[PDB]
Design a protein around this ligand. Structure first.
Ligand SMILES: Nc1ncnc2c1ncn2[C@@H]1O[C@H](COP(=O)(O)OP(=O)(O)OP(=O)(O)O)[C@@H](O)[C@H]1O
Lengths: 389, 337
């Protein structure tokens, strides 16, 4: 039908069959997977000890289904009769039901290549979105690819990154050639969150929530590059030197990630803007883009921090500390304190839901006289309509 | 006997068995056995150093039957029998060995470079099962001969400490025969005729055959200590982690019935993170070894609460009450299963 769309005949011969597909096959897939979240997760790995083993064959078939339906949703939103919402809901559910350890540990090579091709095509799709949007600021193929990107590309990558992060599965999934695409997506999303346009004004939220999921999903501390070489899992160590020369790799972390700043630099602009106390409406980009990295970054790499493991110290992948926390989260607190008086906003609700586990992470002896000010300030600001928790 | 032996195996094993015998004589003479016409085991003297044809026919029989039981056991394990490639019989790499590692005669000690092939852990477990089976066969042979287990080795009384289960078997002997079997099955792999072993997956009912017919024992206080008013507390320490339930019981609880299965007990299952009263629901989390569960009953508000290491357990909702409302009845006493 993509071929015959340019043809004069617009009467699709199997419209009945494609409507049966959309109305029946996809929703029954949805209900089955939603009734059975965990059966696919139960592969004798201890979840559902009563049984419910999902075979390895079943799981690569699930992965192939996911990849092929992603191929269907590629640039076909117009052909879909508004069912793209159902498409992306099934995208979610198959995302949560994915099992990356088992699928990568044992898998068929065509499914392997299909998943890698899917992630590469998604990455280059958002890349060409980047390129066209930034080269052209004048106002229908371009707007069609843009709204396709906003509607489908961001939610699917967000769902994949989220299930990866909340499982801690997917680290072995991102082992080779996934990381080049992941750096491309990182540079691209950072450029979206840095640039200003009516489009990014429309999706304030999407580009501020995708980065948080990407940080949690991604297993390499790109912020702390000083000890990144010394992580054995690093692709820099993996690629030897001959494979660098064969591939198109800059062989340097600073060369391959020049746009993203250092962790100390993010921290120092966070401190500067907190002490400045500017209104939310001069430069919302920072507390909607950098802050998700703070929350998600630190949430992901606590246990990978050297502090938790005195054994294997300074050869951990990151460098995290309770003193970092007492600095950065207090910085968040000062930001929310000084900006409660100006323009309020639901972005603080979004930050609260993101940082809900962070208060659990912080010790009770670190709650006292630190978060109690938050309680007394929130009840003192009864004049302000905003309430938290 | 019930398994049949395939044609590829039947015409390739003669070579496999002679290869295994050659490797056996080679690693023994390398670990230090020399040649001698006179037969002596303490003086490491082997009258059977000759080839399989000049080898004693009984020992050649032992070699054939050991490779039989090897491949037959491999098939019985569920091996997906299939042809891999004739490429290894086409091309094989013989190494050049220095005289120090060489033997006195001109035999080729290492026909194949054993190093480059690495054995999968799933494959490794099956070689462990092969060692288990061989040890059991030897043990039953000893039992047929009349040998029995003893703490001390004595041939006169036919006592052998080695007649123990392989898990209980001594580390040195078990690793020695384990590495010899490594070598045998691994050169079997190295001839390129690698049998396609089954994908090792574990899923089982997992030993419900517990000792005796008892599934649980219930410990309770005397019926005379039943409380009908006030606020009461006691602690329950879990030395281990497993199927244990703690809570409050009515004076009519039945010793043979599980706590909470009926209306006469209110219990908390920490093995499944469940609360039990006329059925099971989801409540709290699971304990570990050494965890202490505090049991709390309030008879004038008819409420029950539980703690794990001090913190109060929660229901599916935010409620802190394990059981919201119940009648006083004849009272309650501490109970644990
Ligand atoms: N005739 C044999 N020659 C060598 N090994 C044998 C023989 N018969 C069986 N085996 C295998 O080797 C093991 C011991 O054989 P071997 O004659 O080398 O004894 P050992 O290790 O020196 O000690 P032990 O005196 O305790 O038998 C047996 O348990 C069996 O697995």
């Amino acid at each position: 039908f993509d071929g015959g769309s340019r043809g004069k005949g617009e009467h699709f011969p199997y419209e009945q069959e494609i409507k049966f597909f959309a109305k029946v096959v996809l929703p029954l897939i949805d209900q089955y997977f939603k009734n059975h979240r965990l059966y696919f997760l139960s592969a004798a790995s201890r979840p559902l000890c009563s049984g419910g083993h999902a075979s390895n064959k079943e799981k690569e078939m699930v992965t192939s289904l996911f990849c092929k339906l992603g191929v269907l949703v590629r640039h076909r939103i117009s052909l879909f009769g508004n069912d793209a919402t159902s498409i992306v809901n099934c995208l979610h559910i198959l995302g949560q039901t994915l099992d990356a350890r088992t699928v990568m540990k044992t898998g068929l090579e065509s499914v392997k290549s299909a998943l890698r091709a899917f992630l590469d095509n998604a990455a280059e799709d958002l890349e060409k979105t980047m390129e066209n949007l930034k080269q052209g600021q004048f106002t229908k193929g371009v707007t069609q690819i843009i709204n396709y990107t906003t509607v489908a590309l961001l939610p699917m990558l967000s769902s994949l990154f989220e299930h990866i992060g909340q499982h801690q599965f997917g680290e072995d999934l991102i082992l080779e050639d996934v990381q080049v695409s992941c750096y491309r997506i990182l540079t691209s999303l950072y450029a979206l969150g840095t640039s200003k346009s009516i489009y990014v004004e429309r999706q304030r939220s999407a580009l501020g929530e995708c980065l948080a999921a990407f940080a949690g999903a991604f297993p390499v501390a790109f912020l702390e590059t000083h000890l990144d070489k010394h992580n054995i899992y690093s692709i820099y160590n993996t690629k030897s030197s001959r494979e660098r020369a064969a591939l198109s790799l800059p062989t340097n972390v600073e060369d391959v990630c020049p746009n993203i700043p250092s962790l100390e630099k993010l921290m120092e602009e966070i401190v500067e803007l907190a002490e400045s106390g500017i209104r939310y409406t001069q430069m919302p980009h920072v507390m909607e883009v950098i802050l998700p990295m703070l929350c998600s970054y630190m949430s992901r790499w606590w246990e990978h921090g050297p502090e938790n493991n005195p054994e294997r110290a300074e050869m951990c992948c990151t460098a995290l500390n309770s003193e970092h926390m007492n600095t950065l989260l207090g910085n968040i607190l000062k930001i929310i304190y000084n900006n409660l008086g100006i323009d309020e906003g639901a972005w603080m609700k979004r930050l609260a839901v993101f940082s809900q586990p962070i208060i659990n992470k912080v010790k009770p002896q670190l709650l006292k006289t630190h978060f109690l000010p938050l309680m007394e300030k929130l009840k003192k600001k009864a004049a302000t309509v905003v309430s938290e928790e | 006997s019930q398994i049949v032996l395939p044609p590829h195996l039947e015409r390739i094993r003669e070579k496999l068995a002679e290869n295994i015998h050659e490797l056996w004589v080679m690693n023994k003479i390398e670990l230090g056995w020399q040649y001698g016409p006179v037969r002596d085991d303490n003086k490491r003297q082997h009258p059977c150093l000759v080839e399989f044809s000049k080898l004693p026919e009984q020992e050649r029989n032992y070699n054939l039957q050991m490779s039989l039981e090897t491949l037959k056991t491999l098939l019985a394990l569920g091996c997906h029998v299939g042809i891999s490639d004739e490429h290894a019989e086409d091309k094989v790499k013989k190494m050049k060995l220095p005289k120090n590692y060489q033997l006195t005669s001109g035999y080729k000690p290492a026909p194949m470079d054993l190093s480059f092939i690495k054995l999968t852990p799933s494959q490794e477990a099956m070689v462990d099962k092969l060692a288990e089976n061989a040890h059991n066969v030897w043990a039953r042979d000893r039992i047929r001969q009349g040998w029995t287990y003893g703490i001390q080795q004595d041939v006169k009384n036919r006592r052998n400490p080695r007649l123990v289960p392989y898990t209980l078997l001594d580390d040195r002997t078990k690793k020695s025969n384990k590495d010899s079997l490594r070598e045998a099955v691994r050169t079997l792999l190295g001839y390129g005729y690698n049998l396609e072993a089954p994908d090792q997956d574990h899923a089982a009912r997992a030993e419900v055959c517990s000792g005796t017919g008892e599934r649980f024992r219930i410990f309770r206080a005397e019926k005379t200590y039943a409380v009908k008013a006030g606020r009461w507390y006691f602690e329950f320490e879990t030395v281990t982690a497993g199927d244990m339930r703690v809570g409050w019981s009515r004076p009519g609880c039945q010793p043979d019935q599980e706590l909470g299965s009926d209306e006469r007990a209110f219990a908390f299952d920490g093995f499944k993170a469940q609360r039990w009263h006329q059925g099971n629901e989801h409540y709290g989390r699971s304990w570990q070894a050494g965890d202490v569960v505090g049991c709390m009953v309030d008879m004038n508000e008819h409420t029950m609460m539980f703690t794990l290491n001090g913190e109060i357990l929660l229901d599916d909702s935010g409620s802190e009450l394990a059981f919201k409302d119940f009648d006083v009845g004849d009272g309650f006493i501490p109970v644990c299963s």
